[PDB]
């Protein structure tokens, strides 16, 4: 019974990072080696596990988180990082057990006139906790004056558009990111290699 990684990695549409998608993977066989040895990925960085051992391991669950960010923001999808994406959109824990997988998606996610569909959160009163998702759109008070829910001077809608242009340099181009979290509870482990 094959893990549905196709549905994750080959989804036509990816989530905005602020509204990052999570798929729970369970009760299935996963060939991680075929992903790890793929030339398709520009980032494949594992924490707390060796990628060469993944086909020999069983986990209680795998969570597949996915979203789009800029090439120059992929460095923020790692334990201990800071910046608008790590702080306000998607935060990995210090004790992360999993792999961060990314690839350039300029051919899918940019278009003539710009693709404005992908958003990020630019403003928040505090940093996200690890694996916290915030999809709120409260007006952010950026000045000394209360906003009273009105977008205006120093009163910001907290989400902004990347506006991906196909002519953007590689740092500004869209990257698709899949984060695999490996859960190791003292319980039956139902997601295994071949």
């Amino acid at each position, epitope marked *: 019974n094959l893990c549905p990684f196709g549905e994750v990695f080959n989804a036509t549409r990816f989530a905005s990072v602020y509204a990052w998608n999570r798929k729970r993977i369970s009760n299935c066989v996963a060939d991680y080696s075929v992903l790890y040895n793929s030339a398709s990925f520009s980032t494949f960085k594992c924490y707390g596990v060796s990628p060469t051992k993944l086909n020999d391991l069983c986990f209680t669950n795998v969570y597949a988180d996915s979203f789009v960010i*800029r090439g120059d923001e992929v460095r923020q999808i790692a334990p201990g990082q800071t910046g608008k994406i790590a702080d306000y959109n998607y935060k990995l824990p210090d004790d992360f057990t999993g792999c961060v997988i990314a690839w350039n998606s300029n051919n899918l996610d940019s278009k003539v*006139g*710009g693709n*404005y569909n992908y958003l990020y959160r*630019l403003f928040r009163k505090s940093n996200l906790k690890p694996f916290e998702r915030d999809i709120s759109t409260e007006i952010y008070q950026a000045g000394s004056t209360p906003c009273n829910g009105v*977008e*205006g*001077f120093n*009163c*910001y*809608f907290p*989400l*902004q*558009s*990347y*506006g991906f*242009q196909p002519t*953007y340099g590689v740092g*500004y181009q869209p990257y698709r990111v899949v984060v695999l979290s490996f859960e190791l509870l003292h319980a039956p482990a139902t997601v295994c290699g071949p």
Partner: nanobody, 121 residues
């Protein structure tokens, strides 16, 4: 504070083209409406073109449709006005203008100092 840095413009003969640029600082493009106004001799300041940087939707006035093209590079915080098929009556001070909402139909809040465009007959 927010600043709008304008560049481009100057002199061109009728039928020629100019490109104006506007760089926003103190604000990040991707939510607000940003665009151009102009003030020709003996005329009130008027809308030229606007782009919603949240969703890329552009707007023009009857005298600018087709000839002028507005575009945004959100990553570079820059908007551009490509002005083709210029006429002497396009002679004006061109102002970059930034709203505090997403809507191009709303009044601008922040103004550039303005850039002279002179089209010779």
């Amino acid at each position: 504070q927010v600043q709008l840095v304008e560049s481009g413009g100057g002199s061109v003969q009728a039928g020629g083209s100019l490109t104006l640029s506007c760089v926003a600082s103190g604000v990040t493009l991707g939510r607000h409406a940003i665009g151009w106004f102009r003030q020709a001799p003996g005329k009130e300041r008027e809308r030229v073109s606007c782009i919603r940087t949240f969703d890329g939707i552009t707007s023009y006035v009857e005298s600018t449709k087709g000839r002028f093209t507005i575009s945004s590079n959100n990553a570079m915080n820059t908007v551009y006005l490509q002005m083709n098929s210029l006429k002497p009556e396009d002679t004006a001070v061109y102002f970059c203008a930034l709203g505090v909402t997403a809507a191009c139909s709303d009044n601008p809040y922040f103004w550039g100092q303005g850039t002279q465009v002179t089209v010779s007959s």
